[PDB]
């Protein structure tokens, strides 16, 4: 009931970005970020780091340490 | 010249585990762990968290944050 996708959404909301704002800044298609936030797709570790970087959180936070 | 593979290797050696001891604790193939340490294959985020747990390190560390 808690997931990486849910923390990615929440962290993006904390940073102020809309989905398309975040995707375009990360040069990822909008559907891909949507798929990640919904836990439909597991991000590769490079992307995981880029998103931690854009939202100003630790990847440890997103993963549920 | 530095990579996730290289930090997983170092972090595992710091924890004291051999490659197969670590593979067996996490029930992943010895070849699979070797492929990760060698940067031949990207760990899925689940495996990345388990290994960070087994070595007592941050996923941020392994990722180069």
TrEMBL record, chains A, B:
It comes from the Bacteria. The keyword DNA-binding applies. Residues 8-62 form the HTH cro/C1-type domain. The keyword DNA-binding applies. GO terms for molecular function: DNA binding. Residues 2-13 have a biased composition (Basic and acidic residues). Residues 2-23 are annotated as: Disordered. Coiled coil: none annotated. Keywords: DNA-binding. This is Phage element (ICEBs1)transcriptional regulator (Xre family). It comes from Bacillus subtilis.
